[PDB]
Short mmCIF file of C-alpha atoms and ligand atoms in Angstrom, two decimals:
data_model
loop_
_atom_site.label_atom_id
_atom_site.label_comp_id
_atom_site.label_asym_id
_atom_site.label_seq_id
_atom_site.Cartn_x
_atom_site.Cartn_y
_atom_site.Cartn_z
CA UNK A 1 0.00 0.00 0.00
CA UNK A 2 1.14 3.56 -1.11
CA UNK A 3 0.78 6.66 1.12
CA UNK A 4 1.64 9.09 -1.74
CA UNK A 5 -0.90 11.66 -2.05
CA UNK A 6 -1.30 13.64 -5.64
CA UNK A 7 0.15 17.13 -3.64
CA UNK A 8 3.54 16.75 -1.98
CA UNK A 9 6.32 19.31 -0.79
CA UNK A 10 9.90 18.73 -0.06
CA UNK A 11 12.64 20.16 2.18
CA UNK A 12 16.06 19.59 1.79
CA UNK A 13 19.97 20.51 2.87
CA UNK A 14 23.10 19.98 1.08
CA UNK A 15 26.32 19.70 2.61
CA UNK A 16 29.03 19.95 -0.21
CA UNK A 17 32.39 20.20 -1.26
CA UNK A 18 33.75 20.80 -4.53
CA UNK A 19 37.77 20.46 -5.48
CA UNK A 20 37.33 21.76 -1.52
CA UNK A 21 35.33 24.61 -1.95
CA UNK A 22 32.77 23.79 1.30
CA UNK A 23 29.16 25.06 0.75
CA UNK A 24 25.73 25.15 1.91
CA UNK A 25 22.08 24.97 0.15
CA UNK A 26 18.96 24.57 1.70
CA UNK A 27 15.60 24.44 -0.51
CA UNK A 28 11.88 23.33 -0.27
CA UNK A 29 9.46 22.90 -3.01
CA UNK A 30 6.01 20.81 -3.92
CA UNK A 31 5.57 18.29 -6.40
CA UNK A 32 2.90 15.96 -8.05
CA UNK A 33 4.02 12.53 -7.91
CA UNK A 34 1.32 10.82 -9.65
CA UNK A 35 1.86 13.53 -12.83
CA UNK A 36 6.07 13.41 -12.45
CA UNK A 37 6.36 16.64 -12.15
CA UNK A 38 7.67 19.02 -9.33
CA UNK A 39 9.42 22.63 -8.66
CA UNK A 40 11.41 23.95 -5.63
CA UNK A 41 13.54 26.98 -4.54
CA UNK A 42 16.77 26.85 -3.51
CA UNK A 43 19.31 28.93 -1.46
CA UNK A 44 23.03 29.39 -0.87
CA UNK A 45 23.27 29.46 3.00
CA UNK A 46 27.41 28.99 3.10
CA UNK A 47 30.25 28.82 0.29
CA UNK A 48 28.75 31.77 -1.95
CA UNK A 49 29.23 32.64 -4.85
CA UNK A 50 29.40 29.17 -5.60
CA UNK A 51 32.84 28.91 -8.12
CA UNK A 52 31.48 25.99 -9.96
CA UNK A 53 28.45 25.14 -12.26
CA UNK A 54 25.21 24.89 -10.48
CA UNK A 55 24.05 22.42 -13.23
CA UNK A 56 26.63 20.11 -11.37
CA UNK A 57 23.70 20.17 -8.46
CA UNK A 58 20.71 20.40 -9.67
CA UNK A 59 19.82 16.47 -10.43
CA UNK A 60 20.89 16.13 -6.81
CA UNK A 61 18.42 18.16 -5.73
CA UNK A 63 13.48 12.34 -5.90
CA UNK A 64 12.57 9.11 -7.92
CA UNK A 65 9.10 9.12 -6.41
CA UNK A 66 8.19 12.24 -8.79
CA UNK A 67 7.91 10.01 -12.29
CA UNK A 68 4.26 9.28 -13.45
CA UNK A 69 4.89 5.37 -13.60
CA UNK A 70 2.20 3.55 -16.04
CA UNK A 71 0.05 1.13 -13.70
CA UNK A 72 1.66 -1.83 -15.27
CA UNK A 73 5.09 -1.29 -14.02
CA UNK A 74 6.01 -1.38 -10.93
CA UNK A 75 6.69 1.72 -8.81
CA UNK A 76 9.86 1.25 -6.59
CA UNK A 77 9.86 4.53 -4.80
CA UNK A 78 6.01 5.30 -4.04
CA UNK A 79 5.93 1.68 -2.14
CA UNK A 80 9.06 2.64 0.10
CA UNK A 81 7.62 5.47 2.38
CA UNK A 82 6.50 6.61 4.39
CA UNK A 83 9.73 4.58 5.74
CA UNK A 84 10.99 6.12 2.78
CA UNK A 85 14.88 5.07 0.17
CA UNK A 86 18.40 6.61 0.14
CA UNK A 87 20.15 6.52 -3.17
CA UNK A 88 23.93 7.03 -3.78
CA UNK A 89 25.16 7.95 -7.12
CA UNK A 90 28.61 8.23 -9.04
CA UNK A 91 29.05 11.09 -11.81
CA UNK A 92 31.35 10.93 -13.76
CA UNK A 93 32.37 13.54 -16.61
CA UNK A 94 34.27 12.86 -19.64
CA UNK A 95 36.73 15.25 -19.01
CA UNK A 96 38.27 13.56 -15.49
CA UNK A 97 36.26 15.78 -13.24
CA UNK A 98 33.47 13.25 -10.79
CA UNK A 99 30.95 14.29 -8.39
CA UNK A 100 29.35 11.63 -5.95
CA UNK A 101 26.19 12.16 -3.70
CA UNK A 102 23.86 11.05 -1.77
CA UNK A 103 20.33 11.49 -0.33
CA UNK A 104 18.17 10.29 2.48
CA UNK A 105 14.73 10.79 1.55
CA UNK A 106 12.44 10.77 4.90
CA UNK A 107 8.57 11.15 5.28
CA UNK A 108 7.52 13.57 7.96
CA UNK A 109 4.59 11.74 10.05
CA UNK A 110 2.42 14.80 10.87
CA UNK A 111 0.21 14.81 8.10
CA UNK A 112 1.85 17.06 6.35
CA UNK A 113 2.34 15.31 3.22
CA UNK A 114 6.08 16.58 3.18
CA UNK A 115 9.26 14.70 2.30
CA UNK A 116 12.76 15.50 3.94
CA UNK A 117 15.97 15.48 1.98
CA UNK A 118 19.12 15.04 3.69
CA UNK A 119 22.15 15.13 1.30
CA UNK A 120 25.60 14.47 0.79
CA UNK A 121 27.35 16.24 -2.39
CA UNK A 122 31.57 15.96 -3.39
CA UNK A 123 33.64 16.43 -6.15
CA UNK A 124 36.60 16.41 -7.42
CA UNK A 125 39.48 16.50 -10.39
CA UNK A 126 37.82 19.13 -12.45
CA UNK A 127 39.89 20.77 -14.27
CA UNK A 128 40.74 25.05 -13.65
CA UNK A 129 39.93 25.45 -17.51
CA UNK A 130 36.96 23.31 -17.62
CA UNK A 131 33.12 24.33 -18.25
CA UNK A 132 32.33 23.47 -14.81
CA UNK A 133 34.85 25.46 -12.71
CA UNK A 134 34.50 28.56 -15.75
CA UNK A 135 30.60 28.29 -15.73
CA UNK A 136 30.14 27.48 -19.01
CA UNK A 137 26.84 24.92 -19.10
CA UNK A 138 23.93 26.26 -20.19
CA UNK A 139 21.43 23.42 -18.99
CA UNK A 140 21.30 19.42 -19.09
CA UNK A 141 19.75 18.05 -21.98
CA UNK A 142 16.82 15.84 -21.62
CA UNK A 143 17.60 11.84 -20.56
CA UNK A 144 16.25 8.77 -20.07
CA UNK A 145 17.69 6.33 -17.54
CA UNK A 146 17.61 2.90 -17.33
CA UNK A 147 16.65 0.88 -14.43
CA UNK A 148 17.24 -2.26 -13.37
CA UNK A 149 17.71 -4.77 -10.05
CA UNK A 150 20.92 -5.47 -8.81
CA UNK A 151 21.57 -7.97 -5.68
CA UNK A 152 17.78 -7.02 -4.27
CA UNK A 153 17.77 -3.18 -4.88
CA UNK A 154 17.67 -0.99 -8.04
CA UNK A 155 20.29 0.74 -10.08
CA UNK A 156 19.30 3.75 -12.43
CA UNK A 157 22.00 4.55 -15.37
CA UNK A 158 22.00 7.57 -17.54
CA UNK A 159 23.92 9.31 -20.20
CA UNK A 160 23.70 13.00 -19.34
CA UNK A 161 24.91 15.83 -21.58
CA UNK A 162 25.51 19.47 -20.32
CA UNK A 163 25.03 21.85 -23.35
CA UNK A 164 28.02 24.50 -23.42
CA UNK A 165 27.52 28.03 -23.81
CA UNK A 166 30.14 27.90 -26.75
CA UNK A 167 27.90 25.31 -28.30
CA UNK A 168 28.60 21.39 -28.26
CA UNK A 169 28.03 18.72 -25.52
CA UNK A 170 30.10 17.61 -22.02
CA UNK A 171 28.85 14.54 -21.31
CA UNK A 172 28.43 13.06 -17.80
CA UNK A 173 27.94 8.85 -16.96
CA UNK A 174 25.06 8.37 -13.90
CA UNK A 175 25.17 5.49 -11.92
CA UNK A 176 22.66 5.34 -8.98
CA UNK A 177 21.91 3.12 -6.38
CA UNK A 178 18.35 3.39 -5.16
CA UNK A 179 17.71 1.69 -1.75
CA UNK A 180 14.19 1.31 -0.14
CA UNK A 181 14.37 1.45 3.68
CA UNK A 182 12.09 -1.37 3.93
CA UNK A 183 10.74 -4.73 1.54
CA UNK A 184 9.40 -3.51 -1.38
CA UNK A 185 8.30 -5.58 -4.86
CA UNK A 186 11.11 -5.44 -7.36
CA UNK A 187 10.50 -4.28 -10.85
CA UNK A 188 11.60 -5.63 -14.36
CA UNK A 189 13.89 -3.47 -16.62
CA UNK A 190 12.47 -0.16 -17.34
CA UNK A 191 12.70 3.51 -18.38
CA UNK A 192 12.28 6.83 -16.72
CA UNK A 193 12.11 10.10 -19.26
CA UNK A 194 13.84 12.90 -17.51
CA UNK A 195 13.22 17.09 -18.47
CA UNK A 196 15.47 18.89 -15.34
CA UNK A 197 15.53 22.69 -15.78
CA UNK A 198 16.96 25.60 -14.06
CA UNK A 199 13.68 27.80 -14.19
CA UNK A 200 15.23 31.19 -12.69
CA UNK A 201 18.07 32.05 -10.60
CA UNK A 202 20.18 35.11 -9.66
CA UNK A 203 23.26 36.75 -10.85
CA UNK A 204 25.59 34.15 -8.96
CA UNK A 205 23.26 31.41 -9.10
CA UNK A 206 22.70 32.48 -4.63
CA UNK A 207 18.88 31.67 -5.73
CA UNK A 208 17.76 29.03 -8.24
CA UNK A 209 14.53 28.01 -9.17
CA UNK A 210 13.83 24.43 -9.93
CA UNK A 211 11.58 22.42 -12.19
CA UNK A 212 11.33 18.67 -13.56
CA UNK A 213 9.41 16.70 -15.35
CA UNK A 214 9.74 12.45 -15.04
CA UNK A 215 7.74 9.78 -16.94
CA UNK A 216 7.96 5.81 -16.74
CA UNK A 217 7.99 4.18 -19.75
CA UNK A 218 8.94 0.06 -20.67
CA UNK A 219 10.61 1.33 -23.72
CA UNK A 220 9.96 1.38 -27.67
CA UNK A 221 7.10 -1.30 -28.31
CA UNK A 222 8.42 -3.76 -31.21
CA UNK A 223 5.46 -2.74 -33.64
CA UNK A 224 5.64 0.44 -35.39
CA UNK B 1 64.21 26.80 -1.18
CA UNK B 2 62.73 23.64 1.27
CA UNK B 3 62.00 23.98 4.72
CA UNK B 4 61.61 20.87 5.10
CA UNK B 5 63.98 18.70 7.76
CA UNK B 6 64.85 15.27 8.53
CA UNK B 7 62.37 14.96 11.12
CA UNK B 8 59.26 15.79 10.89
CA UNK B 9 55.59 15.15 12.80
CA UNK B 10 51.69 15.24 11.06
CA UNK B 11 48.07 15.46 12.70
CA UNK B 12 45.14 15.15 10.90
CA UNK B 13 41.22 15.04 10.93
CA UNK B 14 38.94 12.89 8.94
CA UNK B 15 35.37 12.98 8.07
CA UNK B 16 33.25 11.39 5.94
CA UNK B 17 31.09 8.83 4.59
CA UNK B 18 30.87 5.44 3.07
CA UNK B 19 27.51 4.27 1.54
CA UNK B 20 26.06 7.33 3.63
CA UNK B 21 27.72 6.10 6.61
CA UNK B 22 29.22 9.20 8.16
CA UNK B 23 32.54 8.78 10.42
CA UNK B 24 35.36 11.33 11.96
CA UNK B 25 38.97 9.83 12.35
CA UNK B 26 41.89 11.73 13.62
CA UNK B 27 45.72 10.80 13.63
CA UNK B 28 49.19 11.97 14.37
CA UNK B 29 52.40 10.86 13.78
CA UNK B 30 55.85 11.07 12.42
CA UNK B 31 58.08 11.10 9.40
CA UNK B 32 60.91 11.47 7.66
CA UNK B 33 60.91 13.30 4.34
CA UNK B 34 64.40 12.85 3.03
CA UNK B 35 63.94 8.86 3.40
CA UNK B 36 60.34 8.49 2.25
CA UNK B 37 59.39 6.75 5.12
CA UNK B 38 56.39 7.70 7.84
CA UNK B 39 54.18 6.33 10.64
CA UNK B 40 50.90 6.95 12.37
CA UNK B 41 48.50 6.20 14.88
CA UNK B 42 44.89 6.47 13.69
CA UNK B 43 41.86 6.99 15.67
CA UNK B 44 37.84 6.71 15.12
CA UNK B 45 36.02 8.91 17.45
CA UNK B 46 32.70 8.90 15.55
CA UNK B 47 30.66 5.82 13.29
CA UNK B 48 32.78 3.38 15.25
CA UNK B 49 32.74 0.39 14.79
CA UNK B 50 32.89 0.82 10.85
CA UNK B 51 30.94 -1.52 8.55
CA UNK B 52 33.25 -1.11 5.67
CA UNK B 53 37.25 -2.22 5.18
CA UNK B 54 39.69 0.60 7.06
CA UNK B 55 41.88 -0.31 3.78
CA UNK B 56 40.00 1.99 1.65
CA UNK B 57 40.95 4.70 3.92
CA UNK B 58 44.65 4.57 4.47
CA UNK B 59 45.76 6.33 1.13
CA UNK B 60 44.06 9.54 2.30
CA UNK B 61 45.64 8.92 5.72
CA UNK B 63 51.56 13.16 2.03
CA UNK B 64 53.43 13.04 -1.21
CA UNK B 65 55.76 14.98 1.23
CA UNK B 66 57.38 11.42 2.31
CA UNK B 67 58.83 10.62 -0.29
CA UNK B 68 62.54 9.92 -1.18
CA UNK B 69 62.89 12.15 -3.88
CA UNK B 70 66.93 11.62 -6.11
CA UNK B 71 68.53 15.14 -6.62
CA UNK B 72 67.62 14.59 -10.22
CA UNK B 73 64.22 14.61 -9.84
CA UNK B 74 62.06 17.87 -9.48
CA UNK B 75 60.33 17.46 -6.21
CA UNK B 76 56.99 19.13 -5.90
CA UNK B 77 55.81 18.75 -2.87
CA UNK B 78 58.65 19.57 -0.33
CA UNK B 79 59.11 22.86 -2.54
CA UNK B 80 55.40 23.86 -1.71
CA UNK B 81 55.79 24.07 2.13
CA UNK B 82 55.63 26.43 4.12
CA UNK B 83 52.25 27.63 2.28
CA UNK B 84 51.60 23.89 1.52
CA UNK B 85 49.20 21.98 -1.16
CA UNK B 86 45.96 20.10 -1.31
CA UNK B 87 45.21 16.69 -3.40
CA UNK B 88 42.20 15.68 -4.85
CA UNK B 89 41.42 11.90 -5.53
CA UNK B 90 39.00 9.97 -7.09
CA UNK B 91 39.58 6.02 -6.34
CA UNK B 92 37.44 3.86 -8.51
CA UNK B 93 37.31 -0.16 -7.76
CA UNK B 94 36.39 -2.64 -10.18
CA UNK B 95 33.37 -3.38 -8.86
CA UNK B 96 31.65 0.33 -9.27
CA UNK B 97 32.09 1.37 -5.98
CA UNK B 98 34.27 4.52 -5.79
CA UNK B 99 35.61 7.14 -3.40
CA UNK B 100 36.57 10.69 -3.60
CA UNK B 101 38.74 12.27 -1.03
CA UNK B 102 40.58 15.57 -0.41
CA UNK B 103 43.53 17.05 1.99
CA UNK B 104 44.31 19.73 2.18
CA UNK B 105 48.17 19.99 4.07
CA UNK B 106 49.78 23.01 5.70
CA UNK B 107 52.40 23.57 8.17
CA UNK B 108 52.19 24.87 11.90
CA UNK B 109 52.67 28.17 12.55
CA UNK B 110 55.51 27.92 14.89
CA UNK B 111 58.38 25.98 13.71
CA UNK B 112 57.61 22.55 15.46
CA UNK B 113 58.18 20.96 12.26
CA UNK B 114 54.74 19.75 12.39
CA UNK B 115 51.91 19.38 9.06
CA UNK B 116 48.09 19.37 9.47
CA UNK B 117 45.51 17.58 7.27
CA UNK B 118 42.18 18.63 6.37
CA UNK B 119 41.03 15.58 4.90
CA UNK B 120 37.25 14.84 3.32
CA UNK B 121 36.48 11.36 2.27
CA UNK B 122 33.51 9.81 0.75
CA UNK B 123 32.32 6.61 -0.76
CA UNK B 124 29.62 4.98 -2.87
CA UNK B 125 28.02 1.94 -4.74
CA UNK B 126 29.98 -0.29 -3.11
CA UNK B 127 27.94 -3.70 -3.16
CA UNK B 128 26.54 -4.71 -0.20
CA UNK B 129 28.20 -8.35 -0.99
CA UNK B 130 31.22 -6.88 -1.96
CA UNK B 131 34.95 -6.65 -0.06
CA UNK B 132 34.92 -3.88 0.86
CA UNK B 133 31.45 -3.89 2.67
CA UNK B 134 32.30 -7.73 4.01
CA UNK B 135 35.76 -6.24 5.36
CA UNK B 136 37.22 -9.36 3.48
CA UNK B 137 40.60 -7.02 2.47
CA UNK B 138 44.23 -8.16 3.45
CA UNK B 139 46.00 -5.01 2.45
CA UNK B 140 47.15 -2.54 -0.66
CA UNK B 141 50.14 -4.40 -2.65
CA UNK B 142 52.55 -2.03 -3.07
CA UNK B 143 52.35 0.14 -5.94
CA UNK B 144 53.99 2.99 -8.98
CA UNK B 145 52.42 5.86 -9.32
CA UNK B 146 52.71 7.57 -12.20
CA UNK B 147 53.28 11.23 -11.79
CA UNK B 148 53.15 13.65 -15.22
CA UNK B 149 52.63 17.25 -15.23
CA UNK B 150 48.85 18.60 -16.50
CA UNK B 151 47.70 22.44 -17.30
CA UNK B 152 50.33 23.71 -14.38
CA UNK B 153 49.67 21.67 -11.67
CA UNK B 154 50.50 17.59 -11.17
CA UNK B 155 48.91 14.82 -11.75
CA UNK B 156 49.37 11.14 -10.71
CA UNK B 157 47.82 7.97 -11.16
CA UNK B 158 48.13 4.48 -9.71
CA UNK B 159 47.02 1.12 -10.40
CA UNK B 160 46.44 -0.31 -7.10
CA UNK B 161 45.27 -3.17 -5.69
CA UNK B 162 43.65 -4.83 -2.96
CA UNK B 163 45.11 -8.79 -1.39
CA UNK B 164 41.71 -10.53 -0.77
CA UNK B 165 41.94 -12.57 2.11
CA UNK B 166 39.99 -15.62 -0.45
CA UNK B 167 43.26 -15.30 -1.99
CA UNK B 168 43.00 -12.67 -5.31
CA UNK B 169 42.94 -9.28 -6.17
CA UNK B 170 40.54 -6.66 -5.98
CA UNK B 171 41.86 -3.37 -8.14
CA UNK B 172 41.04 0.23 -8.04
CA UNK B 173 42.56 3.09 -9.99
CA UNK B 174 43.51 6.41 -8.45
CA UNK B 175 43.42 9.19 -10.03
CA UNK B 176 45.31 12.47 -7.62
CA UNK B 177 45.66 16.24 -8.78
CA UNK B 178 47.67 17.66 -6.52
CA UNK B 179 48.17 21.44 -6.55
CA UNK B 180 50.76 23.26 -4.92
CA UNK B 181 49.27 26.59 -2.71
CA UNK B 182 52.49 29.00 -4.36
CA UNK B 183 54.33 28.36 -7.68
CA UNK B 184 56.85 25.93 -7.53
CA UNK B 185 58.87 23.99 -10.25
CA UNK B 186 57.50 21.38 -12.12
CA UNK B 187 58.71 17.92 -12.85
CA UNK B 188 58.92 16.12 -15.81
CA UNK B 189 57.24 12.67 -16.06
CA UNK B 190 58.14 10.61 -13.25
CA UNK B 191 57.31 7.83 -10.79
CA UNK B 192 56.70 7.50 -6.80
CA UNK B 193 56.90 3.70 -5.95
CA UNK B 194 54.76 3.24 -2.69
CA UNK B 195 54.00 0.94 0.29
CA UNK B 196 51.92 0.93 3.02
CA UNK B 197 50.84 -1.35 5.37
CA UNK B 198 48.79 -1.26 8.80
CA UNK B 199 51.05 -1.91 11.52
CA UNK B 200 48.65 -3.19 14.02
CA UNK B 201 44.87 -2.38 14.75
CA UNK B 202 42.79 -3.58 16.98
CA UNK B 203 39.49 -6.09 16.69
CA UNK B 204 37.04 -2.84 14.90
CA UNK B 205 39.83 -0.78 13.77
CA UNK B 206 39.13 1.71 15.92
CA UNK B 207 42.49 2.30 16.68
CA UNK B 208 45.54 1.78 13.58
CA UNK B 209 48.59 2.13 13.39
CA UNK B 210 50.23 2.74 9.75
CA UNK B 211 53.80 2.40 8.13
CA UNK B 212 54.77 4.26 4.30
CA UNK B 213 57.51 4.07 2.10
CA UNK B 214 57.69 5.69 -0.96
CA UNK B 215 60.45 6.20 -3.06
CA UNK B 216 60.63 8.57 -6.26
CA UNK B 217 62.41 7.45 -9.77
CA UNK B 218 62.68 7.90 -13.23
CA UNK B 219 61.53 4.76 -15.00
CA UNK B 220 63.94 1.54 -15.69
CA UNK B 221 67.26 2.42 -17.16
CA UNK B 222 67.32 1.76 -21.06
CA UNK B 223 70.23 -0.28 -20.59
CA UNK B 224 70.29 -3.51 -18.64
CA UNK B 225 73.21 -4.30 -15.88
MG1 MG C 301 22.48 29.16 -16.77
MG1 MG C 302 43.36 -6.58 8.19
NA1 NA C 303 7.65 -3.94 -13.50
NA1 NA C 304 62.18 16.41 -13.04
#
């Protein structure tokens, strides 16, 4: 039994480091888990202006907002109000890697709010690069591809970061989604990702939020 | 010109995370820079007793120790007093993978002493894997492989981990260490390495840990 409700917010913190630079962002937001789709503002509390790429953060910044078809099974929407962690790896093609995590918690008041608690490092990016001279101009659309592994469920995505000068950076996902309790496993399937940067300030000290998720088993095999 | 001496002493504080774990470990010791050779005593005073092998932690636990020939540019004990900071990313076979930074400088009153700021965190490793079993031996010892990239240095390492199921279980570094004033570069080099835990007790709580490290420039072209 599922107690996702069709109106949900979120609050969150992220405690980060990148090539050392400490920082500190704290956001909150609502979302519609049943339609995938969800917004939220965040703020710089410590380590502004931020030297790197917001884009870097912003997919850090909830598996349970997808719209997942009836027939597939929904992962995430069975694992609260106990609630999942994930951990994920990303890895750019130009050396520099980022790694995070996030405890996603239920609050029990009724409120119909989830808690974030996150965990965000990188490292090995380069002084010239797009990331540590600001040069993305948004992620591109993606779909990742889920699948069990050993009793919980991996998500992998090819993610591209368009450049300002035009052209792609590409980026290699690999999350580890882990329900705090026994939930039914799915088969192999998709999720359709749209993650955009909506508004934000001069030195990115505000940013606005907004993405849109969809569930999919893939390209049927008639046309 | 090096300020560095014969003699000299390190503490350091830890914190981090391994598969959202989150743990603080602090550590002093002593070393000797001219002869590449170090030890330390290692302690967890929070997320003790840890669920994952201490092995993946003693690389973070100083280029500085290492027995650099006159030939050889040496980085590292050029950068002192000011110092540098590393940056790692440590990726095992198995997709589970670390990240983990230091950032060194010297005390500020001539007891030969350096301080570490050091970050460490850790994820994907598999719940059945050796790491989160603790089923590690130790690192084999190892040749890192240091070149020079856009100004600063840069040096990678296969390494490996001694199974105790007999085997191997390998993970490739990948440091960018960048000195805090400008100092001379190197040209394309090596650092062969070896460290070992000493002694530790039942959790780990408490480990002690031995280096040596050695710098060189590659097998001579002509043998005997
Ligand atoms: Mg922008
Ligand atoms: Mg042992
Ligand atoms: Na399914
Ligand atoms: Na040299």
């Amino acid at each position: 039994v599922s107690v996702i409700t069709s109106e949900m917010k979120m609050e969150l913190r992220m405690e980060g480091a990148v090539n050392g630079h400490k920082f500190v962002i704290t956001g909150k937001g609502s979302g519609q888990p049943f339609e995938g789709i969800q917004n939220m503002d965040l703020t710089v509390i410590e380590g502004g202006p931020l030297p790197f790429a917001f884009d870097i953060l912003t997919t850090v910044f909830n598996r349970v907002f997808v719209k997942y078809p009836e027939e597939i099974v929904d992962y995430f929407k069975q694992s609260f109000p106990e609630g999942y962690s994930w951990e994920r790896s990303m890895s750019y093609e130009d050396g520099g890697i980022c790694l995070a995590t996030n405890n996603i918690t239920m609050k029990k008041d009724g409120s119909n709010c989830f808690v974030y608690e996150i965990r965000f490092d990188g490292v090995n990016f380069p002084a010239n690069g797009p990331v540590m001279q600001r040069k993305t101009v948004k992620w591109e659309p993606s779909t990742e591809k889920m699948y069990v592994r050993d009793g919980v469920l991996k998500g992998d995505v090819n993610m591209a970061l368009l450049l300002q000068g035009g052209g792609h950076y590409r980026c290699d996902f690999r999350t580890t989604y882990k329900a705090k309790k026994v939930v039914q496993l799915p088969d192999y399937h998709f999720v359709d990702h749209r993650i955009e940067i909506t508004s934000h300030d001069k030195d990115y000290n505000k940013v606005k939020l907004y993405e849109h998720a969809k569930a999919h088993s893939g390209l049927p095999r008639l046309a």
